[PDB]
Design a binder for this molecule. Sequence first.
Ligand code: UDP
Ligand code: NAG
Ligand code: MN
Length: 505
Amino acid sequence: GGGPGELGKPVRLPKEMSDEMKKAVDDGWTKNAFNQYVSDLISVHRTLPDPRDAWCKDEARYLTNLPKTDVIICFHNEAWTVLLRTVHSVLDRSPEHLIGKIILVDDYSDMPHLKRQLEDYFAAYPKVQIIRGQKREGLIRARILGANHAKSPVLTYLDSHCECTEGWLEPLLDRIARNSTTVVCPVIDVISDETLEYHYRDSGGVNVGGFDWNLQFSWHPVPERERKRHNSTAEPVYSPTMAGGLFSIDREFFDRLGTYDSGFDIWGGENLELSFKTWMCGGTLEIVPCSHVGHIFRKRSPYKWRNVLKKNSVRLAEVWMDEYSQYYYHRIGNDKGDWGDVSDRRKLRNDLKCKSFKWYLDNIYPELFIPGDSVAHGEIRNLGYGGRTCLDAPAGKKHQKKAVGTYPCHRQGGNQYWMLSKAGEIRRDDSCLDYAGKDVTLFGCHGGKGNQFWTYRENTKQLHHGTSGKCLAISESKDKLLMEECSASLSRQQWTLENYDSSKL
Ligand SMILES: O=c1ccn([C@@H]2O[C@H](COP(=O)(O)OP(=O)(O)O)[C@@H](O)[C@H]2O)c(=O)[nH]1
Ligand SMILES: *[C@@H]1O[C@H](CO)[C@@H](O)[C@H](O)[C@H]1NC(C)=O
Ligand SMILES: [Mn+2]
């Protein structure tokens, strides 16, 4: 008898339900930003399907002597059944002799079930130790507390809403056992927040980590330069950056790299910091397609707030990004703010004798588009009806299927930051302007030109669409961004593009 959710199948609550049941379902969504009521019906030892490729069972060989790892799971107000299932998943699917301590770091959670109730439950489980923080300090400082209580040669981090799968630990530990400067992440699969269903995929469609120039992590598929390094797609692949929070690193190597920046605030790109340090200071970062961990992805985080990631992102750039720091500052309007004292980190970098950031981009992440190489980058200004209207929209996968609009120019960047590429893209990060006969849209650059292809006609100042033959323009209300027949005499069809350089063409 496996129960609800056995083998990763979804769980759906009745269509019509009593009121007390409704209150509890909503109670669960309010507290956790997933459906706790569903999670509570699912076994804490919920069985899962084997997501590993044929290659991972048959043709992959791992060294016989692997380093003992500690597992650090930070949490704050995590749900009972969810936290337990993460811990029970490590114990049940990891070879006993490879787990030293399962360290649960508390970070000043206040819900009763994580206090004494957790202590009594894991009393029977000797490898589980509970460290309690004295005040809410956030993820970054908590992982550092866990690394201080850990004595095993290797650290492995997991969120409190994860599920390890069959064979998850050996392929990660194998990479470190070959070479200790190697940081590794499992493939991070999706557990539905609504049904807790488990979703895994072919090692063909594996994504490797990069970043947008707002210093946010972002996924991209494995570059061909990398795929050509491998006889099979299930071998470990280089990844210029980690998503963060699920990874394994050598404990002393973690220490040597300065762990996380002590001066970061909660809103941190510590994941980006650790990634750059690993590459630039004698290590490598790998995604191991043979290792799958499920994670409960949430649409929002229900945490107290204490723009705002700006401090952590500027320290990351002031220390680690050399001349390329300027490209982050453009996106935030050069309002760098006050990132605090950062001297300790500059000394740390010099003592380790790390490579330059250009080296990182040139050798590890050369696929990344550098805004300085574009024909123009900055705001896109329309000269019509006052000349104080700018191309303005948000990017991302939620703001796909939105029409791109217009808004008054604030020289602050962000939503009015764009690059005109040599390949005729008007873009922000991996998003491209696109026109297929209804509205102008921002979605994902496919690199095929066509409807994502534009021409800036220097003498006329028009933005010309190759396939529709139309010209880009703004309406009289200045609220909408439309396509119309090209007329040289129309001011609503004129644009000036910041940093236009003819020679980048
Ligand atoms: O102040 C906090 C809030 C979050 N968490 C924990 O940090 C882990 C990762 O956080 P989260 O899942 O919210 O980040 P995400 O994966 O959504 O980016 C989770 O186990 C949380 O319980 C924490 O340690 N301190
Ligand atoms: C070990 O770690 C990485 C993997 O290639 C690399 O930086 C380093 O040169 C490797 N070699 C040695 C001798 O440690
Ligand atoms: Mn998470």
